[model samples]
Target: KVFGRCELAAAMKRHGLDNYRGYSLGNWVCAAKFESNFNTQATNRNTDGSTDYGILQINSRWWCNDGRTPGSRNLCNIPCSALLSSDITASVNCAKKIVSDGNGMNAWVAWRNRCKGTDVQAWIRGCRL
Candidate 1:
C-alpha cells in the first residue's frame, strides 16, 4: 500500500544499499515489488505454516522464526512484526545479512523469478541517485 519507485530507491540508497553484494538498487526494488508489493506490513502464509515477513519477504526459516504459521522463532532476534515497519531499517539490515549468506540475490525467489536479468532501470528513472 506504499512506495513510489523513485522514493523507494532514494530510501534504499540513503541506507547505503546501492550495490550490495553486486546487486543493484533496481534489482532489490524489483524483488520487493513482487515479494511484498512494497508494502512494509506485507505478510504471507506458507503451506508449512511459516510466514514471509516485510517488504523484502524474508523467510522465517533460517533468518526469522515461524515454527508453524504464527509460530515464533525470532531467529533474526527481532520480532517478525519489526520487519513490517515503514522505516525499513530492520528489514534492510536483515536483507544485507541474507544476501551476504547466499548466492547474491538468488536468496530471493522473486529476484530469480522476476528481476533476474530483467531491465530494472525504470525503478530509479526519476530518482536523483
Candidate 2:
C-alpha cells in the first residue's frame, strides 16, 4: 500500500500532530500499513472467534460496549465510511495506543523488517513524515 503526501499530511493533522519529526509519521504509517493496509474495513480473526475491525483494527467485540448493540461494540461496528469519515485522528491515535500499550511491535517490526530491512527503532529514526 502507498500513500500520497497530502493523505499522510491530513492524517497527521487530524491526529493533532504538528510535524512528522522523529519519524512519527513514518512509524505511524508503517503501523497503519501493517495493521490494515490503510483500509478502514480491515478485520482480523481473534482468538475467541471474535474479530478485530476498522482502520486501527480495534477489537470491537472487546473494547466497545455502547449498550450492547452491534455498533456499540467498537468503532468498527459503525459504517466503515463513518469510522473513516473525517476523524482520521481517532484511527491514528488508536493505532498508536495499541503500539504504546505493548501489543508487541511484531507486526510493525515485521513490516519494517521486510520493507526497510531494519529494526523498528531504526525505521522510526529514518522515516520522513
Candidate 3:
C-alpha cells in the first residue's frame, strides 16, 4: 500500500502537476487500486529476469539506463537512478516525461491510453481539469 492516494497526491504536487488535470486524484487512486492495488514495491518480471519497478511500474531495463555516469543524460537529462530514488516526485516526474514531454498530467492521459481503456483527451475533458 505504498502508493496510496495521499502519497500520489503529494508526489503529483511536488512535480508541479495540478491534481484535476487529465485524471483526478480519485481516478488515479482507482486506477492504482485496479492495477497494482497501490503497491509501490510492485514489480513485473520478464522472461529474461529483468523487471518493471516501483509505483508506476517502470520497466527499468527497457526505459532507463545509467545516466549518473558523468554527462550521460540518457533519458531527458534525468538520471535513471534518480528516477528510482526514494523521492516520489522525482520518480513520478521521470515517468511522466517518458509519457509526455515533462507534462505529468498529460502523461497520465498517455498512461490511460496505453493501459486503461480510455481516450486520453476524452478523459481529460471528463475530469474537467
> Candidate 2, which segments miss by more than 4 Å at Cα?
1-6, 17-23, 66-86, 99-129
Model 3 quality (TM-score): 0.52
- Of the two candidates 1 and 2, the one with more favorable TM-score, higher being better, is 1
Ordered by lDDT, highest first, the candidates read: 1, 3, 2
Q: Compute the lDDT for candidate 2.
A: 0.49
Best-performing candidate as measured by TM-score: 1
Over 11-67, each residue of candidate 3 has an lDDT whose tens digit, in order, gives 554565545435444445444444445666565655654455555655544455552
Candidate 1, residues 1-129, lDDT tens digits: the string is: 487777788888888788988878999889889998888989987777677899999878667754454544565677677888889899999898888975878888988999898888767777887
Q: Return the TM-score for candidate 1, rounded to 2 decimals.
A: 0.89
Q: Which prediction has the highest lDDT against the true structure?
A: 1
- When sorted by TM-score, best at the front, the candidate numbers are 1, 3, 2
**Candidate 1 overall Cα lDDT vs. reference?**
0.82
Which segments of model 1 are wrong by more than 4 Å?
66-75
Worst 10 residues of 2 by lDDT: 75-84
Residue 126 error, candidate 1, Å: 1.8
